[PDB]
């Protein structure tokens, strides 16, 4: 259970959590309420695990794309800012945290990946991806490399995959079409083929993660990286002379990074909702609060109008992501495809074919048709194919179901006069196990 009368906040460790903690310390001094800021690894997966039990933080910070899934699980409280507060943030930031009519988070910052480059190694950064192989060749003769970035997280390769035509879900009839997935079209194939080719030709290493790339850039070993504004603070420190610019073009088409709105959701099981609202609206979402965070690690662009007007003067300072529940399937699909293509485990074609399936994993067909004369009232188990390939028909909850034994199983004859048995449970889920004992060899 969550402790009443304090605030526990979770934010990713790459964000300005020390700056956030200072806003927390001021809130503590003014209220006598302890604020604890924590930053567990993989928070975006840990949050729903812990929260569905009524545990977790009072406030969770992530990019808005995760929030639709959280809200559908009932994990997030609906937020209640007055029209006057709403007016202080840009309309489009509110749009990103609106799910099925309701505001489900406060928008904080607008996050976009950029090309970060070392001005000493590369006074003019490339305008195209296509010139990077030649540039790497020149740099290798000097014991440097052109480009290193995180290949383990699909957020960083997506801009190139999307450039020539890849997309997540198509916006059709005023809503994202979850059946229309674009991870396996010509443009997605072309983008990923380029990336694999960079690796095949030793211009990049498949195993490059966040830390190899950040260290490589900051030690002056690579001329370019790809990252968000939060990363600038670490470069500042390193005293590499760096510039920030737009991602290069692929086949003459701009790179297309997926844009995130860092947002702050309130845990539906928190007994501290009015405290969390007060902290967010009156302490964090002020010029002074956002400045405190920005000073730790840059936010880039922010949702708050008054502070964005100051920030827009920064020279260092692409589509908004959907917030739909299917975004986690999408990211998981692309992650897997990229890692498999980059490591040679699959071809680009194979990888992206699997990605299309996995991104649309919520949607087999033949089994549903083979028993559509049923009309059952109340709880039912849906048509389902088991691991052996046996089709279990739509059945009432609380009933044992009987289907013949498969004619063939791994190229093996079985007598179809025998049956297998499966219980459709009282709650409308299939029993995990099927009794196949009777299907004699």
């Amino acid at each position: 259970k969550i402790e009443e009368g304090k605030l526990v906040i979770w934010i990713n460790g790459d964000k300005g959590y020390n700056g956030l903690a200072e806003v927390g310390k001021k809130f503590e001094k003014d209220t006598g309420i302890k604020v604890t800021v924590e930053h567990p690894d993989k928070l975006e997966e840990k949050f729903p695990q812990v929260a569905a039990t009524g545990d977790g933080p009072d406030i969770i910070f992530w990019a808005h794309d995760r929030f639709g899934g959280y809200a559908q699980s009932g994990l997030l409280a609906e937020i209640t800012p007055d029209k006057a507060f709403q007016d202080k943030l840009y309309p489009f930031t509110w749009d990103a945290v609106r799910y099925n009519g309701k505001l489900i988070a406060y928008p904080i910052a607008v996050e976009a990946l950029s090309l970060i480059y070392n001005k000493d190694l590369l006074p003019n950064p490339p305008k195209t991806w296509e010139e990077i192989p030649a540039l790497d060749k020149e740099l290798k003769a000097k014991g440097k490399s052109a480009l290193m970035f995180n290949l383990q997280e699909p957020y960083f390769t997506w801009p190139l995959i999307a450039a020539d035509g890849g997309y997540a879900f198509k916006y059709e009839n005023g809503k994202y079409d979850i059946k229309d997935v674009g991870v396996d079209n010509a443009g997605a194939k072309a983008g990923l083929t380029f990336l694999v080719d960079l690796i095949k030709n030793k211009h990049m290493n498949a195993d490059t993660d966040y830390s190899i790339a950040e260290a490589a850039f900051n030690k002056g070993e690579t001329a370019m990286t790809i990252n968000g504004p939060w990363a600038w603070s670490n470069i500042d420190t390193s005293k590499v002379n760096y510039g920030v610019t737009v991602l290069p073009t692929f086949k003459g088409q701009p790179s297309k990074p997926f844009v995130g709105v860092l947002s702050a959701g309130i845990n539906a099981a928190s007994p501290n909702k009015e405290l969390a609202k007060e902290f967010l609206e009156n302490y964090l979402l002020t010029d002074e609060g956002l400045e405190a965070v920005n000073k730790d690690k840059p936010l880039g662009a922010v949702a708050l109008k008054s502070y964005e007007e100051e920030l827009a003067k920064d020279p260092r300072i692409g589509e908004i992501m959907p917030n739909i529940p299917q975004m986690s399937a999408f990211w998981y699909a692309v992650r897997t495809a990229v890692i498999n293509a980059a490591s040679g485990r699959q071809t680009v074609d194979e990888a992206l074919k699997d990605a299309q399936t996995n991104a649309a994993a919520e949607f087999d067909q033949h089994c549903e048709s083979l028993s559509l004369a049923s009309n059952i009232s109340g709880l039912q188990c849906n048509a389902s194919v088991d691991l052996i390939g046996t089709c279990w028909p739509r059945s009432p909850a609380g009933q044992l179901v009987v289907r013949p034994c498969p004619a063939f199983f791994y190229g093996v004859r079985y007598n179809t006069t025998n049956n297998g048995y499966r219980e459709c449970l009282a709650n409308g889920s299939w029993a995990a196990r099927v009794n196949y004992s009777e299907c004699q060899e």
Partner: peptide
Amino acid sequence: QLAQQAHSNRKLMEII
């Protein structure tokens, strides 16, 4: 090999 393929199928059906 087929009788072994059968004994190996048994173990599978027994789990599933």
